[PDB]
Structures are given as C-alpha cells and as structure tokens.
C-alpha cells in the first residue's frame, strides 16, 4: 500500500525471473554442481532484495 509503483513492479520482475530460472529443479532431482548453483544464485539474491524493502 505504502510501497510505490517501482518496487510492486519489481516484486514481480524479479519473481518472473526467478520462476523462469528454477524450472529445470522440477524436471530432475540430481542435486547440482558449484558450476550451475553460482549462475543461479544471483536471481535468489534478487528476489530477496525485492521481497524486503516493500513491507
């Protein structure tokens, strides 16, 4: 209510994106290498950023 128009967007650019990029988890169980789960980890980092600051 109080969080401006930018940061509700954001809540759901960085979602989408998120979504998007974790999809290839539900095909597979296999746990991943350090390889894949350093270019995943900034998309988290990102969602974090947007879930906080807008409450």
Known sequence: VTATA?????????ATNLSEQTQVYAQSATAPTAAEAAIV????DAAQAAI???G
């Not at 930018?6 to 960085?14: G, V």
């Not at 980890?41 to 988290?44: D, G, L």
């Open 6 to 14: 930018a940061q509700r967007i954001a809540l759901r650019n960085t």
């Open 52 to 54: 906080t600051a807008v």
């Open 41 to 44: 980890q900034p998309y988290i």
